[PDB]
Design a protein around this ligand. Structure first.
Ligand SMILES: [Cl-]
Ligand code: NI
Lengths: 211, 4
């Protein structure tokens, strides 16, 4: 049935969602899981939100990603206004009008990471690796833990995702192409890809690999 | 929550 988590809300706001939840017998939880069906986002008048992990895992799961205005309107009209009319068009990074969650809900038989082996390599921040990993799996990638664990052959397409920030290194990420044969890119390829729910050409995200 |  219905199970929600919220993102970007204040307690009073959260208490309103609780109110909503109790009235409609909807489950409400702290952590987003398989079962989670809705992700309630803080947005602006025009349904743009910030990009939070829950935002991403929401889209990655093709769950309902709906503006907080869904809640308050329902309350304000003693009834559940269908999710359809409160979705988030976009975010403060990937554009105010990309229909991300929309697309996602509309393509679980063809996921942006069809035929991809991804290795999240090195350290990340604000987002634990396993969550980024979970993300890409929800999009149909296959997680690989070690650079050397890539499935050789051709059937598949390998990719190394890094986040330069969390590195404070010398010969670290400029030199990944030395220990494997895959394109290397920043986390932004994934997040951007998931936001728009369109598989983004590596072009813009590749990191300089030494020979 | 953190933003990205
Ligand atoms: Cl936050
Ligand atoms: Ni190919």
């Amino acid at each position: 049935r219905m199970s929600m988590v919220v993102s970007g809300l204040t307690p009073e706001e959260f208490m309103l969602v609780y109110k909503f939840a109790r009235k409609h017998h909807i489950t409400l939880t702290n952590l987003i899981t398989e079962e989670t069906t809705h992700v309630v986002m803080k947005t602006d008048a025009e349904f743009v939100c910030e990009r939070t992990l829950k935002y991403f895992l929401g889209i990655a799961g093709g769950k309902w990603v709906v503006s907080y205005f869904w809640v308050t309107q329902s309350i304000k009209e003693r009834k559940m206004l269908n999710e359809h009319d409160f979705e988030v068009r976009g975010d403060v990074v990937n554009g105010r009008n990309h229909q991300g969650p929309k697309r996602a809900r509309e393509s679980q038989d063809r996921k942006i990471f069809r035929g991809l082996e991804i290795c999240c390599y090195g350290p990340f921040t604000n987002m634990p690796t396993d969550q980024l990993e979970w993300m890409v799996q929800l999009c149909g990638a296959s997680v690989v833990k070690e650079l050397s664990s890539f499935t050789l052959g051709t059937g598949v397409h390998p990719i190394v995702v890094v986040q330069p920030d969390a590195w404070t290194e010398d010969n670290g990420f400029h030199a990944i192409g030395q220990m494997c044969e895959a394109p290397v890119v920043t986390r932004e390829w994934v997040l951007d890809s998931v936001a728009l729910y369109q598989c983004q050409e590596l072009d813009t995200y590749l990191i300089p690999q030494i020979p | 929550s953190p933003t990205f």
